[PDB]
Amino acid sequence: EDMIEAARYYEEKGVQMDRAVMLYHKAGHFSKALELAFATQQFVALQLIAED
Secondary structure: OOOHHHHHHHHOOOOOHHHHHHHHOOOOOHHHHHHHHHHOOOHHHHHHHHOO
């Protein structure tokens, strides 16, 4: 439950929002992370989300 709010805070800042995507992926809530990874063009994040 924690890194969900951590990623929300990072997106609120919007500077480390890639790290917010990383945290969202770590939370298992790939539905929120996949859209952001596609938008940011992070194929590493996309592959990590798809495998996990």
